[PDB]
Design a protein around this ligand. Structure first.
Ligand code: CL
Ligand code: CL
Length: 162
């Protein structure tokens, strides 16, 4: 298991524009197109992202390309974030994948605000961090996914994904 397989499980794969859990226009493997309520706006962002007139449909290879770009972006964002980097550097490889997953879902900003959980993770207070991570809108809105990520940090294994 690795970050790609992990995210593929959590986000799924869709080849036509769809609305995410928050009601936003998305495509592929969790690639957010826009928060705008306009489908035309979404179609426009899609074409600009792909480099062609898609008409709201993309191929599997195109989806995977956006996916690679998005994972790369997430890691790079973590590494440039003053609050995130030190946490990431302190973690084992499995737990690092859990941090990337949260950044991919909620953005660098979203994550950087879990101040208390981050400190606990950096201190390796696993169980406490798990409890603190759960007291969040994130966990209450997407509980199954949040439980998988939380378990990943807590145990340092991929068991929630097998
Ligand atoms: Cl893009
Ligand atoms: Cl969920």
């Amino acid at each position: 298991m690795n970050i790609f397989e992990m995210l593929r499980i959590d986000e799924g794969l869709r080849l036509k524009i769809y609305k995410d859990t928050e009601g936003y226009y998305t495509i592929g493997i969790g690639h957010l197109l826009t928060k705008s309520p306009s489908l035309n706006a979404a179609k426009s962002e899609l074409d600009k992202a792909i480099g062609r007139n898609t008409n709201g449909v993309i191929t599997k290879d195109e989806a995977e390309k956006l996916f690679n770009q998005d994972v790369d972006a997430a890691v790079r964002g973590i590494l440039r974030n003053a609050k995130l980097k030190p946490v990431y550097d302190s973690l084992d490889a499995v737990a690092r994948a859990a941090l990337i997953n949260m950044v991919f879902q909620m953005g660098e900003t979203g994550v950087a605000g879990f101040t208390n959980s981050l400190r606990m993770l950096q201190q390796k207070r696993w169980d406490e961090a798990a409890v603190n991570l759960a007291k969040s809108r994130w966990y209450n809105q997407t509980p199954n996914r949040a439980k998988r990520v939380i378990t990943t940090f807590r145990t340092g294994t991929w068991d929630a994904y097998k």
